[PDB]
Amino acid sequence: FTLPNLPVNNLSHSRVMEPIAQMMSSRNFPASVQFQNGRCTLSGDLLGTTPSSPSDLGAFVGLIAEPGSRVVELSQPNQEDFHAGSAPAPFGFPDFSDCSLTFVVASATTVGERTVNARSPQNFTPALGHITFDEEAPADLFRAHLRNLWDPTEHSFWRIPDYRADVLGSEFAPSVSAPGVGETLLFFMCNVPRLNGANPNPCPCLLPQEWITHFVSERAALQSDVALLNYVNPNTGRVLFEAKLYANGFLTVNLGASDQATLPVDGIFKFVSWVSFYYQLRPV
């Protein structure tokens, strides 16, 4: 079993297309999260809306329902049809809430911005295969990229929106929490552009995109439920701290007596050995 031999500050975020800027763990972070993007088992099984093609992250493909409408019918980001009820949303669709989403929108004839209100039950219904922009949709087939958040809150990057679908369905990526005693989830962080509202940043994710991609490529056999990792200084080889990588695709650390930790991103995670659920991590 292996990880890519790359420093964290060369890795990319997995819920938005941005480089990973920070690494954080905290007892004041939510104990459980249910991100739909950036979700993959160590054996390379993608979960939720995690796109098979990484560049589809935060993107979608839409077509106006009828001339002059604000309503767009959703496809998969590879222009293949989106089957309603098959998933919370088309693959790569943003899993943010408590805000409006402003997308850059590009068709054969136009480039501009459109905004969808994720607070609106009427407009935000991706599981049904269509959403309603705040403005009139472009006349033709377009590709959209998430550009910024409008009027977000502190909860925007931590709580998934109402997809107009039951979150306990098998099509959803399941909730994640640190199972080990005293353990807390390790999050990869970046900042996302936003206008008005309150500061949503930082944006957390469980896994780097490169790790997810690697897992899918390797399809490694797991000899245990938990992989032990050392965070190592690439120049000296010295260990800064150890973490456990659980089979369902997340990292935890032992904060020990501490309630918080902001970790340097110039190190490299290395696979040490296979350990068990009960392995007790040395405090950060």
Binding-site residues sit at: 18, 73, 81, 83, 113, 130, 145, 154-155, 214, 284
Q: What is the DSSP code (8-state) at residue 136? A: P
- The stretch near its own copies (CB under 8 A) out of 116-124, 181-189, 212-220, 241-249 is 212-220
Q: What angle do CA 9, 56, 59 make, to 5 degrees?
A: 105
Out of 216, 220, 240, 247, the only residue in the binding site for its own copies (CB under 8 A) is 216
- If we measure between CA atoms, which residue out of 243, 273, 282 comes closest to residue 8? 243
Give the total of residues touching Zn ion (CB under 5 A). Answer: 8
Euclidean distance between the first and the last CA atom of the chain, given in angstroms as a whole number:
24
Which residues partner with 72 through β-bridges? 64, 131
Q: How far is the CB of 31 from Zn ion (least distance, A)?
A: 16
Ranges within 104-143 binding its own copies (CB under 8 A): 104, 106, 110-111, 143
Helices and strands: H and E segment counts in the chain: 1, 18
Segment near its own copies (CB under 8 A); pick from 19-27, 68-76, 179-187, 236-244: 19-27
Partner from its own copies, Zn ion, none contacting 97, C-beta within 5 to 8 A by type: none
> Are 40 and 57 contacting, i.e. CB atoms less than 8 angstroms apart?
no
- Write down the residue that tokens 């039950």 correspond to: 121
* Chain length of the chain: 284
In whole angstroms, how close is the CB of 223 to its own copies at the nearest point?
Answer: 20
**Helix, coil or strand: residue 6:** coil
DSSP 49-116: T--SSGGGTTEEEEEESSTT-SEEEEE-TTSPBP-TTSSSSSTT-----SSEEEEEEEESS-EEEEEE
Cβ 112 to its own copies shortest distance, Å: 10
**Binding site membership for Zn(2+): which residues?**
18, 73, 81, 83, 113, 130, 145, 154-155, 214, 284
Give residues 165-204 in contact with its own copies (rule: CB under 8 A).
193-195
77 binds its own copies (CB under 8 A): yes
Q: Which is nearer to Zn ion, 174 or 191 (CB)?
A: 191
The answer to whether 95 contacts its own copies (rule: CB under 8 A) is: no
* 210 makes contact with its own copies (CB under 8 A): yes
Q: Give the whole-angstrom CA distance, residue 157 versus residue 187.
A: 12
> What does the binding site for Zn ion look like in residue numbers (CB under 5 A)?
73, 81, 113, 129-130, 143, 214, 284
Binding region for its own copies (CB under 8 A): 4-6, 9-13, 17-21, 52-56, 77-78, 102, 104, 106, 110-111, 143, 147-148, 193-195, 210, 213-214, 216-219
